[PDB]
Every structure is written in structure tokens, then in C-alpha cells.
Amino acid sequence: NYTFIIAGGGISGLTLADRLTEDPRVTVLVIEAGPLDRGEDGILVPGAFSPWLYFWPGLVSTPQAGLNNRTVDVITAQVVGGGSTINAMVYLRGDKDDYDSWGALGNPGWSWNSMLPYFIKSETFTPPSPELAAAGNITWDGSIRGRSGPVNYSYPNYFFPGSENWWNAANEVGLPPVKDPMAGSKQGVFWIPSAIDARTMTRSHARRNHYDRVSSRPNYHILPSHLVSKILFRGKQAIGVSYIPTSGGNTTTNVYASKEITLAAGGLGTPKILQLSGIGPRKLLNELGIPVISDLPGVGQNLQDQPTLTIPYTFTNNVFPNTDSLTTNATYNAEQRALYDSSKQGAYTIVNSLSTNIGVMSLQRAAPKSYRQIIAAARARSASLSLPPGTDPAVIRGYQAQRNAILKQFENPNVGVGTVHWGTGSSALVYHLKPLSRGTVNIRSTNPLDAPEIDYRTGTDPIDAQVYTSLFRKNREIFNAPSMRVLGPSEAAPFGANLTTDEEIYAVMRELINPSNAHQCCTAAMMPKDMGGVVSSEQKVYGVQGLRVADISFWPFQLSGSPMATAYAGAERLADVIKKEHRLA
Numbered sequence: 001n002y003t004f005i006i007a008g009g010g011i012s013g014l015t016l017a018d019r020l021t022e023d024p025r026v027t028v029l030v031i032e033a034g035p036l037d038r039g040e041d042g043i044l045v046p047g048a049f050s051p052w053l054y055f056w057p058g059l060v061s062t063p064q065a066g067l068n069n070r071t072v073d074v075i076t077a078q079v080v081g082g083g084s085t086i087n088a089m090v091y092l093r094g095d096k097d098d099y100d101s102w103g104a105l106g107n108p109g110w111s112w113n114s115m116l117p118y119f120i121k122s123e124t125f126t127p128p129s130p131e132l133a134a135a136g137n138i139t140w141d142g143s144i145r146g147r148s149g150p151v152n153y154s155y156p157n158y159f160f161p162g163s164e165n166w167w168n169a170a171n172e173v174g175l176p177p178v179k180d181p182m183a184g185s186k187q188g189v190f191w192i193p194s195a196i197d198a199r200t201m202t203r204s205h206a207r208r209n210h211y212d213r214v215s216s217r218p219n220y221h222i223l224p225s226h227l228v229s230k231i232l233f234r235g236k237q238a239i240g241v242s243y244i245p246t247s248g249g250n251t252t253t254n255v256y257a258s259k260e261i262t263l264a265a266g267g268l269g270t271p272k273i274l275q276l277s278g279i280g281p282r283k284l285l286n287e288l289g290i291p292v293i294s295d296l297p298g299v300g301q302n303l304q305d306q307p308t309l310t311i312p313y314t315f316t317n318n319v320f321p322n323t324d325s326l327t328t329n330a331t332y333n334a335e336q337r338a339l340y341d342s343s344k345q346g347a348y349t350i351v352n353s354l355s356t357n358i359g360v361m362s363l364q365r366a367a368p369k370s371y372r373q374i375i376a377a378a379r380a381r382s383a384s385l386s387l388p389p390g391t392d393p394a395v396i397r398g399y400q401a402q403r404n405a406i407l408k409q410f411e412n413p414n415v416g417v418g419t420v421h422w423g424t425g426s427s428a429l430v431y432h433l434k435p436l437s438r439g440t441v442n443i444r445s446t447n448p449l450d451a452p453e454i455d456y457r458t459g460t461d462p463i464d465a466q467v468y469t470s471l472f473r474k475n476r477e478i479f480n481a482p483s484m485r486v487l488g489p490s491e492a493a494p495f496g497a498n499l500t501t502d503e504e505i506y507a508v509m510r511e512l513i514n515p516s517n518a519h520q521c522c523t524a525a526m527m528p529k530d531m532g533g534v535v536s537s538e539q540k541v542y543g544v545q546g547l548r549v550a551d552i553s554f555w556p557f558q559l560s561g562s563p564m565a566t567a568y569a570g571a572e573r574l575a576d577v578i579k580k581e582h583r584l585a
């Protein structure tokens, strides 16, 4: 046996396994669906970024009712290190009220104040060079960035010149410099912190910082290329798991834990292990003939992501060099790669197609003249309208509680709802951080090799389009500001300056929005059971003992931010919670 078995070796699972194995008396087995990465340049080198190397195969959405019935490929990691291995390295905390809100949903011990020590513990920030900080407008608050923890983060050591035009344009249209977007607010523009190790200018993924770093430990066991197919019980006690080869061989093996089973299989993997195990909605489990261990209608409910929109541009006078120079100028690409290979300088320190700065805005900052109208529409509409009729009443109550917290965020000048970015080339990116829409992920069968049904339900809540349209218009203000007009931008078809009404704009958005930035969360939510929750404030699955959810399945709702930094910090916090209960070193 092992002391603990962890299902999924992604950000959350490896962070937890690392910390638990600090006690030599504690053995851990991490069972991970994907292989070890091979240190490929497409993983390690930012400018070579190749995320597709380790996408989970064979996942497709249902037709998306809110997006013209489009079906999309579903993107999530299948590799040791999980999303950290293949993500764009964007390393950002949420805003204070995100965590305060999770606490106010009925989770004692959850707040910005309680998370801050764990954000700090998680990481080591390496400052940029002083000349780059001065030239680039890179600022930070050293008091609230970690100095000693395992996740390395820093910045690229270069910026494209057009990033300057964009920064000044953003400032011209009400997005001011942010001193530190890690300080619990991020209203305006700032350099993107990147999960890079500055001594080599390579990715600091969880494979490295929470496994390789500590892989001399004989008590830290890993089994790549295997799937946890079921949790095993003695009565209501979780005692073990079954696992199978990911490649589908007709072999099944049982392994047992003396203390706990931890699920860390991600937003799209954790609910499937629970449902196959008899933990889930009795309607679904009864339909499939799965005996019910714990009737929890929230399992697989409440799916969220953070939609994206790519806006195409042409320019009469774009500045050289820019991100597209890497793809259209072989000489420039070769010279920048040679530069990186020699002295680790230049464009290859930036994740491919990204720039170095970004903007985040509250609803009132996006829509100063109309945000009250959006809030009124959202306040007027019954929460139940966002979910199908016959949704479990506990799931509706939890959704209503989330919705009320998000409407307070809409009123808050210090909580973000959307992002604007320009890579310096042919497209801009606009992200919707705070959707009110909610989706599902449900097993289709008892076959552990079968993909679940994944329905994002993007744009089913009509408030989302109102918010997203406002974010689009703010992006258009940046491109129209004096500092950007000198580059001669114009929106390209199917967008265009000739689309002036909300209806004209959103009709194109409905055809182009991607439901996902691979930020899937919230499908095993941490809320009271009578609110459709799956886990307690201690991340224990209701109705069974010895079973927790560590991955971002547990989140109630999305952050003003991207998930990675909080995925690390939340697993740092859970490690301490488990150590305290079991009196570990």
C-alpha cells in the first residue's frame, strides 16, 4: 500500500505529492494519464511554444446552443505537470474578492488574507534587469511576491517595440499602469508575469518544480501513462483506486492507500472518476447502472471556462520587429534563435505569438456609461433561467449564490471581468473572465476509456454577450487611440469599423468566440452540500471519508485572472490541511 494515492499528476497533484513526501514516513503514488515530457524545445523554450504536443486526444464539445450550435475541439493537458507543461506560462493571482467570495459562499478559512501566505510560499520571483524594468515600465511589490518557493517566475528579457504603442494607447483610454497585478487588484495594464526560470529562460512547469526537484525521494512514486478508472471503498471509506493503461489495454489493477485518496484529475477528469465511482447525480448513475455511494447532484455541474476572441487586423505602418516577424522573416527568426542559443536574449524569451503586457478591466472600467444597465438586466433575471429546467434545486441554489457574488463583483471597481492583449502582430485577444453561463461534463457510459459529454454552454446566459460586447468595444478604443493609430491598424473581416451596433458586432462574436482557454474549472465545487456542492471547506467529498478534490474542479467560480498561480497555491494550502489532520511532519 501507499499512505496517499493521487489521481492526476498535474499542477495540483504534483504540488501536493511534493509537500506530503517532505515527511519520509509518508509514501505517495501519483497516477498520471500522460507520459513524462522529453524536455522538447516546444515545451522548454518560450518562443518555440508547441502546446499541442500533449493535448488530451478525442475530446469534442456538444453543439454549443449559445454559439450557433458550433462544436469545438476540447483542449486540456495529458502529461506529467498537467496544464503547466503546455500552458502559455501566464502567472497571475486572482483579485482579493475572488477568494473572499469563495469564503462567503460558506467556506471557513477561505479569503485573500488566508491565501496570501500560500501564494508567497509557492514561488520564487526573479526581478527583471533594471534597464528592462525602466524601459519597459515593469513594476512589482517585492513584499507580496515569494522569494523561497519552488515555482520560478519572472519576465521575458525583451519586448517588441509595438508593445510601447499599445501601452500608451491603453493609458489614453482609461487603462492605467498597475503597480503589481499580484497585489489583489489589476485595474489597467501591466507586464505579464511568466512561469520561467530566469537562469536558463526555460519553462518552470510542475514536472520540474514539484517533481524533478525532489525526485531523489524514494517515497514519491509516479506512474505515468495510466488512468485512475475507479475509487475503491470499504463502506463509505475510500481505500484505493483501480487503474488501467491510458492506451486501452484490457488490464486493470487495484492499489490501496492507508490514509486518503486525492483527486487531482482536472476540471474534465475529476468529475468522471467520481461519477464512475458512484459519486454523482443519482439520475445519471441510475441510468448507467452505477451503484450510488454518494448522491451529489453537483458532480459534473457548474463547468466554467474563460472564453476567448481573436480579432484580426491589417496595418499600413506596423513597426519592425514584431511577433509576426518570427513567422514571415526567416532571417529575423534565425538571428533571434541564434541570439537565444548564445546569450539567452531576445524574442525567444517571450511565449510564441504573445507580447509582454496586458490589460484587465472591471465592468465599470469597460462600460462606464452602461454597466448599471447590464447589472440591472442580470439582477432582474432569475438565476434558474441560466440552467435547464429540472436542474437539481440544490445546484440552482448554489448557482444563485455564485451569481449574487459575481453581480457584487460587477459593481466593484477593483474586480476584473475581461482582458485585452495585443501580440504585436495580426490579431488582438479579448478574454471574458467572469461568465455567468454554466456548463456540464458527464460520463456517457461505464467504459473508463470513453470521453465524457462536455457542454460548455457558452453564451447561454444572455448577460455574457452584453459584458463581452463591452470588452470588444474597449479593445476598439485602444486600437483607435493616438499611440496605435500611428501604426495604421484596421479591423479585418469578419470584423470591421463598419460594424457599429451591438447587434452587428455580437453576430460576428457568436461565430468566432472560443468557449475555452483550457481554464476548465468548478465541476466538483467547494460549496455547502445544500447548495449543490461536492466538497467541504476542507475539500472532502460529501458522504464519504478519506477522499478529497485538489484540482480546480473544487473552485466555486472563475477568477479575475488565469488559474495556474492559484492551482499551485491552493495545493500548497491543501498540503498543510492534510498534514494537520494526519499529524504529519
Ligand SMILES: Cc1cc2c(cc1C)N(C[C@H](O)[C@H](O)[C@H](O)COP(=O)(O)OP(=O)(O)OC[C@H]1O[C@@H](n3cnc4c(N)ncnc43)[C@H](O)[C@@H]1O)c1[nH]c(=O)[nH]c(=O)c1N2
Binding pocket: 007, 008, 009, 010, 011, 012, 013, 031, 032, 033, 034, 051, 075, 076, 077, 078, 079, 080, 081, 082, 083, 084, 086, 087, 088, 089, 090, 091, 092, 226, 227, 228, 229, 264, 265, 266, 267, 268, 269, 270, 273, 517, 518, 519, 520, 550, 551, 552, 553, 562, 563, 564, 565, 567
Ligand atoms: C494549452 C493550455 C494553455 C493554458 C492553460 C492550459 C492549457 C492546457 N492554462 C490553464 C491551467 O494550466 C490549468 O487551469 C491548470 O493546469 C489546472 O491545474 P489542475 O491541477 O486543476 O489540472 P491539470 O490539467 O494541471 O492536471 C490534471 C491532470 O490529470 C490527468 N488526468 C486526467 N484524468 C486522469 C485520470 N482519470 N487518471 C489519471 N490522470 C488523469 C491529466 O492528464 C492532467 O495531467 C493556463 N493557465 C494560466 O494561468 N496561464 C496560462 O498561460 C494558461 N494557458
Ligand SMILES: *[C@@H]1O[C@H](CO)[C@@H](O[C@@H]2O[C@H](CO)[C@@H](O)[C@H](O)[C@H]2NC(C)=O)[C@H](O)[C@H]1NC(C)=O
Binding pocket: 123, 124, 126, 147, 148, 149, 150, 151, 152, 197, 198, 199
Ligand atoms: C528558482 O527558485 C529557487 C527557490 O528559491 C532558487 O533556488 C535557490 O537558488 C539559490 C542560488 O542557486 C540557492 O542558493 C538556494 O539555496 C536555492 N533555494 C532553494 C530552496 O532551492 C532558484 O535560484 C530560482 N531561480 C532563479 C533564477 O532565481
Ligand SMILES: *[C@@H]1O[C@H](CO)[C@@H](O)[C@H](O)[C@H]1NC(C)=O
Binding pocket: 065, 067, 068, 069
Ligand atoms: C441550434 O439547434 C437547435 C436544435 O437542436 C435549433 O432549435 C436552433 O434553432 C439552432 N440554433 C441556431 C443558431 O441555428
Ligand SMILES: *[C@@H]1O[C@H](CO)[C@@H](O)[C@H](O)[C@H]1NC(C)=O
Binding pocket: 135, 136, 137, 163, 164, 167, 168
Ligand atoms: C513607459 O511609460 C512611459 C510613461 O507613460 C511612456 O512614455 C513609455 O512610452 C512607456 N514605455 C513602454 C515600453 O511601455
Ligand SMILES: *[C@@H]1O[C@H](CO)[C@@H](O)[C@H](O)[C@H]1NC(C)=O
Binding pocket: 250
Ligand atoms: C478483458 O479480459 C477479461 C478476462 O479475460 C475478458 O473477460 C474480457 O472479455 C476482456 N475485455 C475486452 C474488452 O477485451
Ligand SMILES: *[C@@H]1O[C@H](CO)[C@@H](O)[C@H](O)[C@H]1NC(C)=O
Binding pocket: 320, 329, 331, 332, 335
Ligand atoms: C528581416 O529581418 C532582418 C534581421 O533582423 C532585417 O535586417 C530585415 O530588414 C528584415 N526584412 C524585412 C523585409 O523586414
Ligand SMILES: *[C@@H]1O[C@H](CO)[C@@H](O)[C@H](O)[C@H]1NC(C)=O
Binding pocket: 491, 492, 493, 494, 495, 496, 497, 498
Ligand atoms: C465592411 O468592412 C469589411 C471589413 O473590411 C468588408 O469585408 C466589407 O466589404 C465592408 N462592408 C461593406 C458593405 O462595404
Ligand SMILES: O=[N+]([O-])c1ccc(O)c(O)c1
Binding pocket: 051, 073, 074, 075, 514, 516, 517, 518, 519
Ligand atoms: O481551449 N482552447 O480552445 C485552447 C486553449 C489554449 C490553446 O493553446 C489552444 O490551442 C486551444
Ligand SMILES: O=[N+]([O-])c1ccc(O)c(O)c1
Binding pocket: 090, 092, 186, 306, 358, 359, 360, 416, 419, 431, 433, 517, 519, 560, 561, 562, 563
Ligand atoms: O490578466 N489576466 O487577468 C488574465 C490574463 C490571461 C488570461 O488567460 C486570463 O484568464 C486572465
Ligand SMILES: [Cl-]
Binding pocket: 034, 035, 036, 224, 225
Ligand atoms: Cl513516460
Ligand SMILES: [Mg+2]
Binding pocket: 127, 128, 129, 130
Ligand atoms: Mg537582477
Ligand SMILES: [Mg+2]
Binding pocket: 134, 137
Ligand atoms: Mg515608468
Ligand code: NA
Binding pocket: 129, 157, 345
Ligand atoms: Na538582458
